[PDB]
Amino acid sequence: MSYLLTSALLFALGVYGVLTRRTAILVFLSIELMLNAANLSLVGFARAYGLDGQVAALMVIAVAAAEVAVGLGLIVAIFRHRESTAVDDLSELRG
Amino acid sequence: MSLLEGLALFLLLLSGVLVVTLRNAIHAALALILNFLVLAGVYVALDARFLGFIQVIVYAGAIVVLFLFVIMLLFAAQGEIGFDPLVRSRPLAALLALGVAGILAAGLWGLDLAFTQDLKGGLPQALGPLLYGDWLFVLLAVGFLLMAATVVAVALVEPG
Amino acid sequence: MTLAILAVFSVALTLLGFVLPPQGVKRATLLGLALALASLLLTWGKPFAFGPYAVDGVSQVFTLLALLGALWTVGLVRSGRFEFYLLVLYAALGMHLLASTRHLLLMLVALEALSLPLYALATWRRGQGLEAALKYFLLGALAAAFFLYGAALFYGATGSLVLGAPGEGPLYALALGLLLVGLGFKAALAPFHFWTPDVYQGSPTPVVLFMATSVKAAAFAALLRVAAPPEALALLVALSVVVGNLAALAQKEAKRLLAYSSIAHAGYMALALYTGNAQALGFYLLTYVLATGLAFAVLSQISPDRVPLEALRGLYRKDPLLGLAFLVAMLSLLGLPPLAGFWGKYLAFAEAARAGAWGVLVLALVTSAVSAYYYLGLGLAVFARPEETPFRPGPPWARAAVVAAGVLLLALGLLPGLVLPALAAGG
Amino acid sequence: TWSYPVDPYWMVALKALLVVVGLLTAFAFMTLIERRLLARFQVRMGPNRVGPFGLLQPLADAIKSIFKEDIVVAQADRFLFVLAPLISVVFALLAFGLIPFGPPGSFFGYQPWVINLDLGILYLFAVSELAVYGIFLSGWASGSKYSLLGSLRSSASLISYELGLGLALLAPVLLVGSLNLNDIVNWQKEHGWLFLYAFPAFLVYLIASMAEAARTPFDLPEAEQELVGGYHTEYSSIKWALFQMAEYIHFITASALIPTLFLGGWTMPVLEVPYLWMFLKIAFFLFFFIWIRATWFRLRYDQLLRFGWGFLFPLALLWFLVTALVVALDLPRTYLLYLSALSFLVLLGAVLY
Amino acid sequence: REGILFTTLEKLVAWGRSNSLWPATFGLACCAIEMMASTDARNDLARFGSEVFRASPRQADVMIVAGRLSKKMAPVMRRVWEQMPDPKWVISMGACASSGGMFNNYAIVQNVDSVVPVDVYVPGCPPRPEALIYAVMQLQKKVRGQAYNERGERLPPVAAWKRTRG
Amino acid sequence: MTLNVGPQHPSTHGVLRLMVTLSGEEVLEVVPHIGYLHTGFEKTMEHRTYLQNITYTPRMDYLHSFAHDLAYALAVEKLLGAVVPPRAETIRVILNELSRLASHLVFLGTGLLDLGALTPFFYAFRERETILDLFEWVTGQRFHHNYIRIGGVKEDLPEEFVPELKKLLEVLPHRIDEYE
Amino acid sequence: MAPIQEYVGTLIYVGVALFIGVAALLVGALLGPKKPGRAKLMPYESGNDPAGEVKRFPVHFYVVAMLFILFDVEVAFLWPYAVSAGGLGLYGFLGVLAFTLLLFVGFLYEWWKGVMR
Numbered sequence A: 001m002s003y004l005l006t007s008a009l010l011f012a013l014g015v016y017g018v019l020t021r022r023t024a025i026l027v028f029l030s031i032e033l034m035l036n037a038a039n040l041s042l043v044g045f046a047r048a049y050g051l052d053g054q055v056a057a058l059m060v061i062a063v064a065a066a067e068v069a070v071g072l073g074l075i076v077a078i079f080r081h082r083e084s085t086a087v088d089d090l091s092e093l094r095g
Numbered sequence B: 001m002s003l004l005e006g007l008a009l010f011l012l013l014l015s016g017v018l019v020v021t022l023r024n025a026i027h028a029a030l031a032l033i034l035n036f037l038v039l040a041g042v043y044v045a046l047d048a049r050f051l052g053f054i055q056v057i058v059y060a061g062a063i064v065v066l067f068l069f070v071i072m073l074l075f076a077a078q079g080e081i082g083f084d085p086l087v088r089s090r091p092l093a094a095l096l097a098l099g100v101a102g103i104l105a106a107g108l109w110g111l112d113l114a115f116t117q118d119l120k121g122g123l124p125q126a127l128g129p130l131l132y133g134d135w136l137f138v139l140l141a142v143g144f145l146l147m148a149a150t151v152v153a154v155a156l157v158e159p160g
Numbered sequence C: 001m002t003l004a005i006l007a008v009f010s011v012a013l014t015l016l017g018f019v020l021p022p023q024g025v026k027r028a029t030l031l032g033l034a035l036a037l038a039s040l041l042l043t044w045g046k047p048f049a050f051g052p053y054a055v056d057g058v059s060q061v062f063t064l065l066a067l068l069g070a071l072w073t074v075g076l077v078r079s080g081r082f083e084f085y086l087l088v089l090y091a092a093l094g095m096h097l098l099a100s101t102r103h104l105l106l107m108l109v110a111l112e113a114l115s116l117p118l119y120a121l122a123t124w125r126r127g128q129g130l131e132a133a134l135k136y137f138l139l140g141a142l143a144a145a146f147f148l149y150g151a152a153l154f155y156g157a158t159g160s161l162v163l164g165a166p167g168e169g170p171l172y173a174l175a176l177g178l179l180l181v182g183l184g185f186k187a188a189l190a191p192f193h194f195w196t197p198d199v200y201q202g203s204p205t206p207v208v209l210f211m212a213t214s215v216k217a218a219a220f221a222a223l224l225r226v227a228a229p230p231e232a233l234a235l236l237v238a239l240s241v242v243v244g245n246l247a248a249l250a251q252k253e254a255k256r257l258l259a260y261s262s263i264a265h266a267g268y269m270a271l272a273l274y275t276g277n278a279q280a281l282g283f284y285l286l287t288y289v290l291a292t293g294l295a296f297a298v299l300s301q302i303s304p305d306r307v308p309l310e311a312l313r314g315l316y317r318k319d320p321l322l323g324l325a326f327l328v329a330m331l332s333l334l335g336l337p338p339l340a341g342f343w344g345k346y347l348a349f350a351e352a353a354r355a356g357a358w359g360v361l362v363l364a365l366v367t368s369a370v371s372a373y374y375y376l377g378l379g380l381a382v383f384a385r386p387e388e389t390p391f392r393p394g395p396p397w398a399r400a401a402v403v404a405a406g407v408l409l410l411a412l413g414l415l416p417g418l419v420l421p422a423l424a425a426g427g
Numbered sequence D: 001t002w003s004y005p006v007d008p009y010w011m012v013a014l015k016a017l018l019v020v021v022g023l024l025t026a027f028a029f030m031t032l033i034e035r036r037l038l039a040r041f042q043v044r045m046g047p048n049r050v051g052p053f054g055l056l057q058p059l060a061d062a063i064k065s066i067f068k069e070d071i072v073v074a075q076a077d078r079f080l081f082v083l084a085p086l087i088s089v090v091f092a093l094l095a096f097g098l099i100p101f102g103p104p105g106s107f108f109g110y111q112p113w114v115i116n117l118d119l120g121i122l123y124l125f126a127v128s129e130l131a132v133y134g135i136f137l138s139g140w141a142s143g144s145k146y147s148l149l150g151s152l153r154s155s156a157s158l159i160s161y162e163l164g165l166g167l168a169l170l171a172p173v174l175l176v177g178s179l180n181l182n183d184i185v186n187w188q189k190e191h192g193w194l195f196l197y198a199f200p201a202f203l204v205y206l207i208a209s210m211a212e213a214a215r216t217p218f219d220l221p222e223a224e225q226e227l228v229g230g231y232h233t234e235y236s237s238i239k240w241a242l243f244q245m246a247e248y249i250h251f252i253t254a255s256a257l258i259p260t261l262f263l264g265g266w267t268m269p270v271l272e273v274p275y276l277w278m279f280l281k282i283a284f285f286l287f288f289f290i291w292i293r294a295t296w297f298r299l300r301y302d303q304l305l306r307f308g309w310g311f312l313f314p315l316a317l318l319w320f321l322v323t324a325l326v327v328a329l330d331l332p333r334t335y336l337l338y339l340s341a342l343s344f345l346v347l348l349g350a351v352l353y
Numbered sequence E: 001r002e003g004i005l006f007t008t009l010e011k012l013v014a015w016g017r018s019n020s021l022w023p024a025t026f027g028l029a030c031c032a033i034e035m036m037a038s039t040d041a042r043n044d045l046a047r048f049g050s051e052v053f054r055a056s057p058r059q060a061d062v063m064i065v066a067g068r069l070s071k072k073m074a075p076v077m078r079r080v081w082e083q084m085p086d087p088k089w090v091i092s093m094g095a096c097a098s099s100g101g102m103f104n105n106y107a108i109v110q111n112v113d114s115v116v117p118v119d120v121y122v123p124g125c126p127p128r129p130e131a132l133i134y135a136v137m138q139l140q141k142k143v144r145g146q147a148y149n150e151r152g153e154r155l156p157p158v159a160a161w162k163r164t165r166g
Numbered sequence F: 001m002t003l004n005v006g007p008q009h010p011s012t013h014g015v016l017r018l019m020v021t022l023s024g025e026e027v028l029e030v031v032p033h034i035g036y037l038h039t040g041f042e043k044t045m046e047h048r049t050y051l052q053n054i055t056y057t058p059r060m061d062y063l064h065s066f067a068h069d070l071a072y073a074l075a076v077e078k079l080l081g082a083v084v085p086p087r088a089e090t091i092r093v094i095l096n097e098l099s100r101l102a103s104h105l106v107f108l109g110t111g112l113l114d115l116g117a118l119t120p121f122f123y124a125f126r127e128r129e130t131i132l133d134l135f136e137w138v139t140g141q142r143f144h145h146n147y148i149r150i151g152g153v154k155e156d157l158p159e160e161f162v163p164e165l166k167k168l169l170e171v172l173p174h175r176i177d178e179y180e
Numbered sequence G: 001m002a003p004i005q006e007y008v009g010t011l012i013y014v015g016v017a018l019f020i021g022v023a024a025l026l027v028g029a030l031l032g033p034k035k036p037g038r039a040k041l042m043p044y045e046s047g048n049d050p051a052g053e054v055k056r057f058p059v060h061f062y063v064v065a066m067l068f069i070l071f072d073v074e075v076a077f078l079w080p081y082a083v084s085a086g087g088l089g090l091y092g093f094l095g096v097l098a099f100t101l102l103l104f105v106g107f108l109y110e111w112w113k114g115v116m117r
């Protein structure tokens, strides 16, 4: 149960991260931590329910990685000719 | 139990604290690896061995490194680059953070389950048949997903 | 089966397309889709599982719609690139996958599968289309984390990793909400919507068509396999229809407007969920699709990029047929009789009334009047504003297609009781 | 493991501590010998004074190394500068205690190895990534973009080859059914050494083991006569030694791994003498590298990349897949034995020149 | 901090250092090939601990000023000298360095010690390779603390720790 | 970046400063900057005897000294009108060509070392030494060779020189092949 | 199976390494002269700085990195397969074969296109 409290804390923490930082990459960083909070949770439940949450975790992991890549690709492509890093700064769309 | 166990969670959480404070990108990132270190240890402690190794392999090995290459690429070791369009939002962030945990905590107070039906589960031995046969759908999905990702990723950089 | 076609074709095509010139690849892509679609038709009325992957009637219906949309959109653009087809292909497949399983993790994965290439498709390489993209991605991953947290709590609440488990209350109660979170963003339900107009502004029309159709479909579709508190739903809906219409007063641009519109529609769709009757919801979305499809098609022949409302006006001059089509569209979106939208609306409402939710339902009715403002605001404008500015005459492809559609609209307007009897059998 | 009983923690520690400094001394005398051994080849004679046979020189070298403040620049990253070597050296040291040296427990009643794992390879593989962390970090730490850019080349490249090692390590794990080292050895104890069974995987593994900074990749770089290497260049005293050190430990770790894999660790069909056979393999591979070191050159990295990417990794998994097929299909493995040996002969003969 | 407690220790450390000395040669002219000679083949720096050569002079400390030097090259060289850490020696290799021979231009620099300390002169442009060997033996034994001058004057084992970097 | 690849860096046998406009992996252009070894020989030597000037020639290129040497010798000899013993020209050419070989040794020596393995250098050097040794004998010096006293050399070869010269001519073909 | 013991042993190994690490550094920090630079703090490209242009650098590095991730994941899966394999029979093998072929498309895309961009 302790562990499950811990997981929730890390989720919360990440949020505080995401919300404070206006620098996008650091946001993105935070996100990742939350995701892992999840995987911990899975492990806790695996102790109840029999280890399907391991396999789960693995799948999840892979997905996270995938979205990382793509997100960074975007991040790249955005500041491949632009020098900002915090991105509400860019607000061309707005209305 | 709770002696060592207690400590490791303190530390883990601590690592978490660091990364959301740090405006030294590098310092941040570094902490997060150390995070995963603990987490991996804890995985093993909760008898998830394979998962332990993979945590390391992927995240630390690949993921953060890629991240790092970018931030180096973009020459920012710090998010301290401007000053915020809102600063009022900081305590408000902190407010919400408490709330989101509170609800989860409440929800989780009102139960306990088993935690006990196997041991030595981290072994790929018994995990293979499930994956191979049942999670196989997912597997194939995943495999394609990656491929698509690749193509996407490419398309991000140069057109076609 | 159809899936079979998708995976293979995609894979093969990937490399193959180098041999071909992009037009030959466009040709290719068109074929593939049509075959996959075909395979649905020929199997319509039998369910086929292989594992948890289980194509049912419901799935089938929604992917009819989706595939259609993607064909059209590719139809519309020849000034693009083959990658911008490929990715669509991919995405579609991803959504097929979403519908035909009740295994949560796959479903999650499916959301990602559809969202990723969409981001890439989000640019005609313009600066705007990167901002738009970015936001959407960023928000998507956030919602992901929630959706993931939900799933974990399902494994928490039961050893099940597939829908269908009843649990107890609170944890399970909680857990389910977070699934609504994911889905919410994906259907762009309020209060998970902010971005969608803005993103539309940033993104070029054809893309937007596709996004505004398929993803919403998929979302509602999948949402249907999940079950939920009527109270949550009621909230969401309210915010969606209200904010939608209110911001629509503020508007001066097509792209954002239509987003808001499809949020109101999302509110309406979410009514159906009170019973989860996919005969009703099936019908609705089908009909909804047509109209929505129509609207962007027209808009593309104007510009396949952002253009404010005013620019549009005088269309009957430009072509009479087009003027009528677009007109019909506005009415359809109003959901008037003898257009299928009225019935669609009604049906949803019937599921609501069973659910016995009054206040909400009433409010819904109110705001459904509101919407008419902008529909006539456009629809009459068609005939007026005799100034003419950039117009693109397009192919016979689209013209015929569109006019078929506007008639088809009014056709189910008169015979909605045609398909619906033998709709949504679950297999 | 569970299949073999464990030592109490104190005794582990003792062994650990020993082996650590053991590997210090290992490198020490190796450099000395390599230097000299090159000389002989290279129509020159090595150290023979301050020895005699320069035997006291490593000590001397070390003493020299100290008493010099390892320079810190303005525009430095304080923590990282110090940290970056530490880490790498830590991760170089680690993963060798794992390995046994003789039959179980049979080191004077105590375990040859320091630790050991059922899940062997993974650990190895895992630790290998973390040195590379060090690589680029040092670059960054220094704040030299010259160094940095090099480190990116480096790290990237390293990491590509890192992947090929994985695909190699799949193969024997099939055969034994496990990545438990003991078991792998023991398999060979009955069935035979792994160099028999998968000659083209042996090849690619070798050529992957190059990638542990082992030269002949060798646009590693160094600063001498090239676009400078990262890590070093902006360091000085002890820290420079550390980099170098690490590189050697990789080298030495590798010098063990290739025997472990293809021939097994210690072990001979002709006689069992415990300790001897291990050192002898080690020794060999060492010398073999030195032949490489001399008689082989520098690529141009472009070439290398093309090579790994275009040839090695797809081809490695291609071969693997074959092997996976055999093992999956549960037939006599004989046909593969037959094929491997022949395929090597073919693949050499096809390009005999 | 350089090696000392009692008598024993410092002499020890100095011996260690001296016998391990690491040449950073700094070619600039005709010298270089004779230096390459001084390494190669039937020449041996092997047992002389000076079989060690490192591009970073941040990672070496014995400077062998080997070549010919221009006004235009002088400040450059100045920085090069500067870019050495704390212990560090100047061999002035051959005549060209040491004073600069026949060239007596208004266009040149002469007599390198102007801009650096010198510990060892070794003239000859070139000298015999072996003289440099002899030189390093010199510099070795200089650092061994036996160092003297022919005017009967003591020469400390450092004399270019008498031109300092901070 | 615009890298300013300076003297001796990285460990370049030569020196000079190069402003390398680097496009990214493909270089744009190099703006060369030198003057880092200029002297002004030509002035000083105009303040010298012609005979004295003969010492300045080996300080130009030293890899092949003799070409300078020859070129100058001849030029002068010609200029005020002079002849040369047959034996002289023969030897002078021998020496010249030997110096040519030397030059090549260094050219290739550096090539081999520089990129690729360092090693082949050492053998070429072994041979180079031989050559140099040959030179030591005859000119009393390792290099910067002086023998030419204009109108020939100073005096005829050692006789012992002739055997030793043979030796190296035996080895060299055999030796060459493996380097090639 | 595994002894919990050896994980203990793991921790052991690491703690040792860190001490010896720290020892070397403590030597390093305290020893040597305390004489600073002030212009040796400027880079070694010949006393030249690499500064001369500041620009954006190859996507090459991204490409490679990204590649590696995907394939590292690939590998991940093939390890379980490695463990349990013949027991999974032909249906095992076929699934994997399919999967593998998918990732091979990534490679192949990049072979005709070329990693240099």
Ligand code: SF4
Pocket (backbone or CB within 6 Å): E029, E030, E031, E032, E034, E066, E067, E068, E093, E094, E095, E096, E097, E124, E125, E126, E127
């Ligand atoms: S001092 Fe002698 S060896 Fe040196 S540059 Fe002059 S000639 Fe060459």
